[PDB]
Write a protein that binds this ligand. Structure first.
Ligand SMILES: *[B@@]1([O])O[C][C]([C][O])O1
Length: 261
């Protein structure tokens, strides 16, 4: 189709490898570009860790208010919110918000710990029907994004389906789903990525990811005004280990997708 030709052209112009999956929930139609290739998730994996903790909170009703101590040894390479609470506590809700809205890596590691390790995050994915997602490492090493390395990867198709189930479907309880949506809508790191390729009137909830090999990712739920919502996953990675981020590619892919609707 037109959109696949334009996405291929965008990819060719970028020098990297682009993966896109769109679900239009109006007719459950899908648009895929390298939809079944693995890509390093980087921080887009934080959505799965947060959702897993939310799922736990359906039975442990007060879990999200549980205080968790932030110690200096907990700090890793990028902790914009946890840094503000060293030698203090953050609740699991606050850690989930920080992981999602600020991409805080210390927060992610605390969520992983709450789940019993990366295998606990992966187990949640399996439990909601995602056979592709795999989380293998903690922060910051899960962002190494080495070409061909299957660790800490998923495919665009799988992540789109899973993000749909978490935000628009019923993989989570009603209050948990609403909380996740609220967190995603309040993301602070996405302004130059998918959001930049979409009409300013559309409401977006998204989670970015960045890593080595110029890996530049964004996963989004999109609520166009007067239209069924869309789920859009855009993964991008490059052949040079020290390549610069290319959020403009994600913006451009979103724009191409938006034009075809
Ligand atoms: B994710 O990808 O978003 C930011 C952090 C940087 O380590 O990880």
């Amino acid at each position: 189709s037109a959109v696949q030709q334009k996405l291929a052209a965008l990819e060719k112009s970028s020098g990297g490898r682009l993966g896109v999956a769109l679900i239009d929930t109006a007719d459950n139609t899908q648009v895929l570009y390298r939809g079944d290739e693995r890509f390093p998730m980087c921080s887009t994996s934080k959505v799965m860790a947060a959702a897993a903790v939310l799922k736990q909170s359906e039975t442990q009703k007060q879990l999200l208010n549980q205080p968790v101590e932030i110690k200096p040894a907990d700090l890793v390479n990028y902790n914009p919110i946890a840094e503000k609470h060293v030698n203090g506590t953050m609740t699991l809700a606050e850690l989930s918000a920080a992981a999602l809205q600020y991409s805080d890596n210390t927060a992610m590691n605390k969520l992983i710990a709450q789940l019993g390790g990366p295998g606990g995050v992966t187990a949640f994915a399996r439990a909601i029907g995602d056979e592709t997602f795999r989380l293998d490492r903690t922060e910051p090493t899960l962002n190494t994004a080495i070409p061909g390395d299957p660790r800490d990867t998923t495919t665009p198709r799988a992540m789109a389906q899973t993000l749909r189930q978490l935000t628009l479907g019923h993989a989570l309880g009603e209050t948990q789903r609403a909380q996740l949506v609220t967190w995603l809508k309040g993301n602070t790191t996405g302004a130059a990525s998918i959001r930049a390729g979409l009409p300013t009137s559309w409401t977006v909830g998204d989670k970015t990811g960045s890593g080595d090999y110029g890996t530049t990712n964004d996963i989004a739920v999109i609520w166009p005004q007067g239209r069924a919502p869309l789920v859009l996953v855009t993964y991008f990675t490059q052949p040079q280990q020290n390549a610069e981020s290319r959020r403009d590619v994600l913006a451009s892919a979103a724009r191409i997708i938006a034009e075809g609707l």
